[PDB]
Design a protein around this ligand. Structure first.
Ligand code: NA
Lengths: 236, 238, 236, 238
């Protein structure tokens, strides 16, 4: 099922998405257009692997602060004066059980589900890969996530198409099978030295392509079987 | 006030440390040796700064420390199996008290709740030149002893505090926060300019280089002017 | 200052209310009409006191009761009227927010532990009136807000209380008439129960013409704390 | 499996109880005697039902227990100074696993995550007919020992479990959940009809009358079929 959270008439609902509608805890159906989308869950810590699409001897891990989190339909703030702001459609993996020293072959047995992430980045602030890209990628609103927490629906995370649209125009396409380090490998590498807890999130990277956005653009990211994450952009 | 959190007889207490004793919410006294020390508060996000002690980096070299690295006073630090170069790092930790976004340096300290001590440990074997210092080197479990107190309304100037580190009771290093390249105010201004800092988020201000290597069996005791002493023994991973 | 929390363009803001304007963390202005009001803070446990307004003596001890966090509703949120209920009433009450841990605190020291104040509408369905949980702890039965007012209230026992239904004044009261003061209540409660920062104490309400019906718009006001407004709809 | 949480060497571990041993997230074993037991999970809101054991009341007599009453296995219960009639209450505790609103009884148990043992203590000295039982009598600090485990996927029928309570090693009472006036399913239906229950919220199902008076110094050990044993000593307040 596709779990979601939304705000309606002052109440936060934890529901399920079916046949284009949101069913709340009481079984009452809601139309997406009538509610205010929220994050499908509350993320613990969020790590991402850079340059993971065609390999490096070790995953180049980076952090995304929770203050960068943004829900579906939320507005991404374009850095004042920036010139090179890109979007990054990526498969987000949500941990379901505590992970510590878990073998790659068992890694998937600990996953709760998946969702869509827009790992934005402002290249203007990146000199090179020497220091962590915190000012360039950990900015407020730079991590739209959702709209759903898809549980027990994805058969293989390494076999999913990835698409991205800007103002409706398909400006990108790709597949996750071309992932240098798999989800199971990333979880194994990470959990060897760091305990991953339920709801922690792993961003798996994105393939290179047309991704520069400007104020006024509406980005729509889609991943096989995970719905579509849409976010407009505006100057700060 | 030196706020502290501890576990005693099954109860978690949010109290205060005074003259050697721990007082709980009701004012009842507890001996440190009879309780289990906990983190003085629950940290939100934690950022550190590399090379911030004595021209300086064009901009603060920020990095992240995961919450799973957190360890309370007296907790056991786990030495990475097979590692050969593990170092402690005595740093002044700054705890945010009010939401910060685009705060000027001259106003930054007005948003600070209090201060505590941090041991920003690093396993240099894992250090690289990609997003340095890498998460695998700085964010291992237990690599962030923090505490024992959340000292509020006591620190006059964060840029005027001595730093000391002991290993097995012997002084290994002496520093002073006046030697900070980027001041606490400048760091908060820099970070809050693009990232909202929420109450209880923590900023690790760096440490001066020294004879900081440690090995299994060693007991690290870090002290900062007016912030007490953070002590942690090191054991080898099971 | 009047602290407030609101949702705007997908972002949750912790700001302040000045001159009819909502200022976010960065100090940027927001028009109330452009945002979605939320609770001014996240409450811990909420206790209320019954019969606290009246040669009859006051109760031998405060008649304490609980309001579940699931009853909480923000300013402008929709209160749900119980199907078939004949006697649903609003209750305008001064809500006290704890700021420091309280255990065995003396009345003379009690107010020193208070963070701030806000308005509460402690709704009740008298039809279902043992702890009145089914009558008082229903979902949406605790509108709370709009602000967490700190460092402004000089004396909690010297504030007027007012309630309007559909813009028409229904009742006027004054906190000086409380049988047990805020200080006495916190002393009584903290004697046996540890109160934590953000726990809330509802101080009661004087009897009045407070019956409400589906379609009604309730606007409660307390001296210096603004106005809390909530419309009522029949349960879906 | 019997889920448990414990503190060891400064670290909070979420483990599993197998063959009298606690295994952490990494699979490493810990001896109980070497760790500090904690609550098996963090409860949301807790509701209890009064007079639920041997027709029946028109509707369940629901009441609240504050999270501040929560106490872990082995924790010390504080006896109210001057109280003359304090009683333990062995009850089956039901832990909600999925959001519940307007759930029918026939489907209720499908929303249950697991079960645990609860000691719903009461100081009868403070009971009257005003919102009975009063919060002052039931909601005192430490008046809700809970645990030691969150037993999931093991209880086949909550209405078919024996209840036992021992004071200082001596059997004080024996009961059975089949004697519940309102079943777990009926209670969750009644409650969820007007109140949304969230994951980790807890329902206390009541207890049968018995010789349950306890005094300072007593060691209470409550047991429920398949849920282990919850033990707590009693001490007088400071
Ligand atoms: Na009331």
């Amino acid at each position: 099922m596709k779990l979601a959270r939304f705000l309606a008439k002052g109440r936060v609902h934890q529901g399920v998405y079916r046949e284009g509608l949101l069913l709340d805890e009481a079984g009452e159906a809601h139309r997406p257009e009538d509610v205010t989308w929220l994050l499908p869950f509350t993320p613990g810590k969020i790590l991402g692997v850079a340059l993971n699409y065609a390999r490096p001897e070790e995953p180049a891990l980076f952090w995304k602060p929770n203050t960068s989190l943004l829900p579906h339909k939320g507005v991404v703030l374009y850095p004042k004066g920036a010139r090179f702001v890109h979007y990054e459609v990526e498969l987000a993996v949500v941990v379901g059980r505590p992970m510590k020293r878990v073998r790659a072959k068992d890694a998937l047995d600990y996953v709760l589900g998946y969702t869509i992430a827009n790992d934005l980045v402002a290249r203007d602030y990146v000199t090179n890969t020497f220091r962590p890209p915190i000012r360039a990628k950990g900015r407020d609103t730079f991590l739209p996530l959702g709209p759903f927490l898809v549980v027990e629906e994805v058969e293989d995370p390494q076999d999913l198409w990835l698409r991205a649209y800007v103002n409706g125009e398909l400006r990108q396409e790709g597949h996750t099978s071309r992932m240098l380090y798999s989800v199971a490998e990333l979880l194994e590498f990470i959990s060897e030295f760091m305990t991953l807890e339920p709801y922690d999130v792993l961003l798996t990277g994105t393939p290179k392509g047309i991704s520069q956005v400007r104020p006024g653009d509406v980005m729509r990211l889609e991943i096989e079987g995970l719905g579509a994450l849409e976010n407009p952009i505006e100057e700060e």
